[PDB]
Symmetry: C3
Subunit: 211 residues, 3 copies
């Protein structure tokens, strides 16, 4: 079902895209939803509740089983060619999560800019766990059941190992991050989608990563 | 919903509590199940197998999608105002697990006092993993997919970070616990449920924790 | 029962075995499934997609809620008396996974001989993460939500702690492995199934380990 309530809510979804079994809900005003061409956003549950919310999903994006919650003044951006399996994305506290071009997120991803509940200093009663944006660079591959906490920024051309929890940002591109505490465990690499290729040179989508 | 088999089983669920979609199975005798007032115990699967088992859920408890297995002479105690998402609790070896008041347990918790199977020392043939009680103090917030194993004691007003595993007791209240191995990672704090409270002083339920 | 489709597939499931609520799908050629006596393979979903794949399950194996995916020329063998709760097994790159006798695999296991996608070194463009066989020895106990990645070999009589991820093989038998990174955390032990025993000496299945 598609469902919309409020004023100046804009919703653009190409007729060349598939939204089978997906629920989209927009409640509030000046919210915008864009889904580009040749997308498959299936069996997903997407919920925008608040004001000035922006969901932008570029062309050739495939998402299956995404559970997504966005609150007022929040935005989610997902760039072209990115693929995503079952998972969860939560944005609150007027923040932003972005996901770069040609990412590959395996089932079980949990991504959030927020803890959803405040932690205060006993010293001065002040809140000290405020939301922080999440940026996942281009060509990032998340293995199964990876969790990305607030403020985490992930460099381009990175692979995150199965069941890793990221609570801190990294700077180094072209590497594998794994373990607990999450750490760079391999450098100078590039990942691809197709195991049938002999070398990186056989995959024309990787040219920009080795030069 | 409900299904019994045995005698002198005492089951009292307040008419003011909800058990929508919940299964209660009691197989055995002299068992008592107590569910207080204004409770919401939903989409759960609770079973007691054996004798003299104690399930006590105090008032103002909300539990959704709990799978719970209780064996002979075991007791589960959940104090008032506690909320719990999806998860599992397993109790055996006629042992004990209690959960304090105003706890907030996020989806994916796993809590157990037992390994369910023996491990013995080759050195002296003795068993070395006897079950041990779990004590979760007042006002504890478990992040997602937190695992709480046998004999673990958690102090009052503690936050456990997402995907942490706890195999050991902590004694310090007012702190955040995270990482592998789990350790105090922040000190002198207090958590609340509502973000829209700027400071702890704006939260009536936090009075006690600052003195 | 099962949905089989292609040329010369052989499915041999002992008449003494229960397959309640299990879906077995075979699509391809020259595939072979053997399930031995007194097995209970229930609520599982076993998919063989490709050619020359083999699945071998020995006697007295009990599996509940297994989601299994085998590709061409792959092989899964599960030895006698092994029990398995809900979990996932994935095999590709023409590799194999082998699970020993009398293992105990708790709910949430994930076992794979492949990453499903290539990683290349920038120094020469060559692939560095080829799939690698997984071998779980006899009498291995996986606790809850254990993940076993490619190439991993686990020794006999090992307990893996719950929520442990294994990315590397171990060589030492009779130990508890846990934590992150995964390490030997207790040596010189043996586990059993029934906790009603003063000592190991009261469990006859355990004699062979001392
Ligand atoms: C959409 C889809 O189809 S994807 C879904 C299915 N696939 C997956 O989930 C991916 C599974 N793979 C993994 O999680 C990881 O192994 C991947 C691919 C990041 C890494 O693969 P590889 O490049 O072969 O890494 P390889 O195992 O060498 O590991 C590299 C190093 O990190 C170390 N390491 C790997 N994981 C960990 C860990 N969890 N903790 C500590 N160290 C680790 C290894 O010991 C190794 O160290 P060493 O070189 O000093 O000996
Ligand atoms: C019931 C519900 O609705 S809950 C819904 C879902 N929400 C969640 O699961 C909450 C997610 N948050 C977390 O898991 C934790 O970070 C929290 C909330 C417990 C604590 O958050 P914060 O107070 O912001 O502290 P923060 O996460 O920055 O960590 C504090 C210190 O611990 C460190 N740390 C955090 N996680 C880890 C980790 N896994 N390993 C090692 N160190 C860690 C941080 O790096 C920081 O170190 P520093 O001394 O350099 O600052
Ligand atoms: C089919 C079925 O019925 S299975 C049912 C479900 N059961 C389970 O999932 C099993 C749950 N148990 C576990 O995951 C593990 O604790 C088991 C049993 C291997 C380990 O149990 P035990 O033998 O009692 O060992 P326990 O965890 O104390 O031992 C851990 C040791 O290494 C350390 N350790 C344990 N876990 C960790 C961890 N996650 N990270 C770091 N260190 C750890 C502990 O400190 C302890 O050593 P210490 O006392 O010197 O400090």
């Amino acid at each position: 079902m598609y469902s919309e309530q409020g004023i100046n809510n804009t919703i653009n979804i190409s007729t060349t895209s598939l939204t089978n079994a997906t629920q989209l809900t927009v409640i509030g005003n000046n919210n915008s939803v864009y889904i580009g061409n040749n997308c498959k956003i299936v069996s997903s549950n997407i919920r925008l509740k608040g004001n000035n919310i922006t969901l932008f999903i570029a062309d050739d994006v495939e998402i299956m089983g995404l559970v997504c919650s966005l609150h007022s003044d929040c935005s989610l951006q997902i760039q072209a060619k990115t693929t995503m399996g079952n998972g969860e994305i939560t944005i609150a506290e007027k923040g932003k999560i972005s996901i770069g071009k040609d990412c590959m997120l395996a089932h079980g991803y949990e991504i959030r800019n927020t803890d959803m509940h405040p932690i205060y200093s006993l010293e001065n009663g002040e809140r000290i766990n405020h939301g922080k944006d999440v940026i996942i660079g281009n060509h990032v591959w998340l293995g199964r059941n990876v969790t990305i906490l607030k403020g985490v920024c992930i460099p381009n051309n990175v692979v995150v190992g199965s069941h890793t929890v990221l609570y801190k940002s990294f700077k180094e591109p072209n590497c594998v991050i794994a373990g607990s505490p999450a750490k760079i465990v391999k450098e100078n690499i590039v990942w691809g989608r197709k195991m049938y290729h002999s070398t990186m040179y056989d995959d024309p989508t990787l040219n920009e990563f080795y030069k």
